[PDB]
Amino acid sequence: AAKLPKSFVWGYATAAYQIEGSPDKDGREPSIWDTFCKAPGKIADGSSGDVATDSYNRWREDVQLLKSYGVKAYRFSLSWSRIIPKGGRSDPVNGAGIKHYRTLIEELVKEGITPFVTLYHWDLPQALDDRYGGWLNKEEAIQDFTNYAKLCFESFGDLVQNWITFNEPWVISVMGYGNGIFAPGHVSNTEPWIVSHHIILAHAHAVKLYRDEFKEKQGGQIGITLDSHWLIPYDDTDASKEATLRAMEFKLGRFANPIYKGEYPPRIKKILGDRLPEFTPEEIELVKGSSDFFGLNTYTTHLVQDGGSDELAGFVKTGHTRADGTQLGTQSDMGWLQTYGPGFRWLLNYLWKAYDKPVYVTENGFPVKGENDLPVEQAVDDTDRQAYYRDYTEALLQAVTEDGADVRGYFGWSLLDNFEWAEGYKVRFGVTHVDYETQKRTPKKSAEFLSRWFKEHIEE
């Protein structure tokens, strides 16, 4: 059989607020998500990340679990408010929080697991939102994020060589400031575009800082993680084809074109007008080529139709139902997500050709439909999740070894069942079952499948 090169890395990914718990332990102060979960009606099951999988306290067991799975890497995020509680460049730094992550990283090193560290996975310190509105203030947000990044490079950089600045700015902007579904719960036809602009700049400043002051001595790389589905035109009409291109600009192009090519794409600039900020010449220069690798989070494929009424979506209609009624694939616990391996293959090729940077799939996973209602003995036989990974790893192998797309990493989402943001704990994404009443971890069959597949498909 075909095999990925020995240099290929695989493992699992997690996010701090989704698994840590211990929200006020060792000096941590609130993030906007802690605040958001205390707002009635925002979380489907009225839950929060107050406990989650108690992974801040159980960090050692989680590392041992990863090692037992034979992973080569582990992607996780740092809670900004554990490192600089209030978040700002002039606020007190929290040694205990820094030490917690340092110790965690050192254990990964001792176990031979490569750490992939996400600086920002949505948990902006609440103090910065109250102080200047977080990402809404260009100069303050850029300076504070850059300082935070610098502190992280100094604190962990001699052990970490793979950095991710932001996780899914599309989500941060659209869900957090466009429709208010995610923290901080803002709704506006202007803020999402402003936040996106400022994040692109904050990202670029952190990358320049890394390259100029840390890259040569630490020997690592830094990039951004962008989410994207594979998009297919609903039919062969010009309107459908154009709608698909427009949808891609609104989901991905508005982030990838500036960062990899040097400017915002044409359609979004025309549609948003003066609501889309303009980069200055110096900013364009700073942003262009500001990602060493292409971090990608992907889960499914969507059919695209022209005629949408939601500007946040780019005025398109997306779904998983074809004109003849056929569904794209197996249903998951979330309506928008269906199993469609071919789309993953097409997307990997598309990204390599379009942006010319090695792709690292920083998230790919599946939530079994109704799994939250199953007892552990039944949950472990996660047939649909195994099938999903079977289809997607096959697409990955074909994309690289056959097609020739440059893809160097794959991280399953997620290691453990955990807090799924606005969906609460109802949606289960783990390859490891977690009983929230005992915190017991029980590997699901999908974990065995992935361990075996990567062991057999990565050159020895």
Swiss-Prot record:
Active site positions:
168 (proton donor), 363 (nucleophile)
State the Pfam families in the record. Glyco_hydro_1 (PF00232)
Q: Which reaction does it catalyse?
A: Hydrolysis of terminal, non-reducing beta-D-glucosyl residues with release of beta-D-glucose
GO MF terms, alphabetically ordered:
beta-glucosidase activity; cellobiose glucosidase activity
For this protein, what is the EC number?
3.2.1.21
UniProt KW keywords: Carbohydrate metabolism, Cellulose degradation, Glycosidase, Hydrolase, Polysaccharide degradation
Describe what upregulates or represses it.
Answer: Expressed constitutively in cellobiose and glucose cultures.
Supply one GO BP term. Answer: cellulose catabolic process
Q: How does pH influence this protein's activity?
A: Optimum pH is 6.0-6.5.
Q: What is the effect of changing residue 227 to N?
A: 17-fold decrease in affinity for cellobiose and displays more acidic optimum pH than wild-type. No effect on optimum pH
Report residues binding substrate. Answer: 18, 121, 167, 299, 413, 420-421
| Cystine residue pairs | none
Note the PANTHER family from the entry: GLYCOSYL HYDROLASE, LP05116P
Purpose of the protein: Plays an important role in cellulose degradation. Shows hydrolytic activity against several glycosidic compounds.
Q: Which family does it belong to?
A: Belongs to the glycosyl hydrolase 1 family.
**What is the protein name for this chain?**
Beta-glucosidase 1A
Record gene name: BGL1A
